[PDB]
Amino acid sequence: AGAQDFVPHTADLAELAAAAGECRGCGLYRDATQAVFGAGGRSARIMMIGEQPGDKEDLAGLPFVGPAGRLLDRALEAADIDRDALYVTNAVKHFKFTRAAGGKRRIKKTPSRTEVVACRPWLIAEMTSVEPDVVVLLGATAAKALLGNDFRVTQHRGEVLHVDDVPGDPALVATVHPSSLLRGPKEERESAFAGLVDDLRVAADV
Ligand SMILES: O=c1cc[nH]c(=O)[nH]1
Ligand code: SF4
């Protein structure tokens, strides 16, 4: 089922990342440039999970390198968290996208629950490998990947969650995806940014 047979029996992140380059666990590997595995080391206490690599990440081979990543770095710095000490990854490892005539970018398309479930074996391997004390779930797709398809990020802000089917029973904190804070009225973006910093500080205080 899904990516399971493509996941080797190793906690070495470099070996896992190389194996993910060969994954065919769903259809998304076909049009994407490459798999984008997580970045960071196994000593990380905090794991952060986004939805999927976007246009820039698909070509950089690294997560959170575009505008959403720059806002996330501003929030991490405000929360006094060193990005270099985190393990940062995504629920889905291949960019799902389309282009619009006249567009300046490839446009993300939402992964189906089917694709998230197919890719989840990689997240389980990452979590088993890193043994984080806390997992920050950035956005609906990531949070639902671990907390259920009905989970609503908007309803659980600031909350330390724990579920029974997650490796090592880490604390889970679900928050807004940084891409949500890039657009909207200034006051709304500023309030939302403060809330993201708050949630990052809850996770770091675990
Ligand atoms: O790595 C990335 C970049 C943008 N958005 C995500 O969810 N993940
Ligand atoms: S998105 Fe995940 S499950 Fe699908 S092919 Fe890529 S690595 Fe495999």
Author numbering: 2 to 207
Paper text:
UdgX excises uracil from uracil-containing DNA to concurrently form a covalent bond with the resulting AP-DNA. However, UdgX is unique in possessing a flexible R-loop (105KRRIH109). Our earlier studies allowed us to propose a reaction mechanism of UdgX, which involves the formation of a covalent bond between H109 of UdgX with the C1′ position of the target deoxyribose sugar concurrently with the uracil excision from this site in DNA.
In the reactions of the mutant proteins with ssU9, the entire substrate was converted to product by the H109G mutant, while hardly any substrate was utilized by the H109K mutant. However, H109 substitutions by Gln or Lys, showed poor activity. However, to better understand the mechanism of uracil excision by the H109 mutants, we determined their structures along with a pentameric DNA, TTUTT by X-ray crystallography. Nonetheless, all structures revealed the excised uracil and the side chain substitutions at position 109.
